[PDB]
Design a protein around this ligand. Sequence first.
Ligand SMILES: NS(=O)(=O)c1ccc(O)c(NC(=O)NCc2ccncc2)c1
Ligand SMILES: [Zn+2]
Length: 257
Amino acid sequence: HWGYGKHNGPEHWHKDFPIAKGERQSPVDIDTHTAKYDPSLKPLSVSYDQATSLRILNNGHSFQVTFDDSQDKAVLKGGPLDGTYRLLQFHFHWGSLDGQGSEHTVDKKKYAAELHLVHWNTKYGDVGKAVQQPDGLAVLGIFLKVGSAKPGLQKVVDVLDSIKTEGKSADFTNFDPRGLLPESLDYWTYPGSLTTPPLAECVTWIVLKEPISVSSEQVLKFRKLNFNGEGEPEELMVDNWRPAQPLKNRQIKASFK
Ligand SMILES: NS(=O)(=O)c1ccc(O)c(NC(=O)NCc2ccncc2)c1
Ligand SMILES: [Zn+2]
């Protein structure tokens, strides 16, 4: 029912998900001058060495690669996290044009896309219990800009033709998530929400300072995807991003001076 068009887009979501006007909603603009360097933060430790990708799926608002999370195979720990968070999926948000597409903004600058890597707190047992917890989820957000091609993205790009419309999935084994990470792991962090319905306020956002670059041909193939399912009017999947929400009583902390 909810979507990203004029009639079902982010400005209507509060009618079905009243938490959309809550206190810790996401995304936000990261004012880099008002973020506080916090030395009490630990380095991010990404242990994706034994990650097990399963499928890629068009869910009708994005495409999503899923992982086997029944074991500590790909985990995130450190940073502002307490405990161990298992990788569950990643997905992308992107625009119709290269000057918009990201959900988070940095000094009001929008990037061409955003990669979201979704992890959940193992102490809660499964992901459906974690999403009801104030600290149940950790999302690692990575900006994409348009420049040179990114090799570790090309395997995703090559299969997009197989999942063009909503509900299609394809096998997607032996994918390495480390190929999507920038060279530096400097980050901002703040407590937030999911950026799509149901917009649960369960996320510790970790947003990386350094973007990854992708080529225009690579992003062009993202925009060839469809919101609709097969046998329907053709709606290209673009501008699947929520606009920035007020920070309200929240401080953004930085891991880097
Ligand atoms: N962009 S995000 O903050 O990293 C993010 C991370 C994990 C998520 O699960 C979502 N949200 C969904 O996956 N919503 C599907 C759904 C829609 C309506 N009813 C039930 C389920 C957003
Ligand atoms: Zn997302």
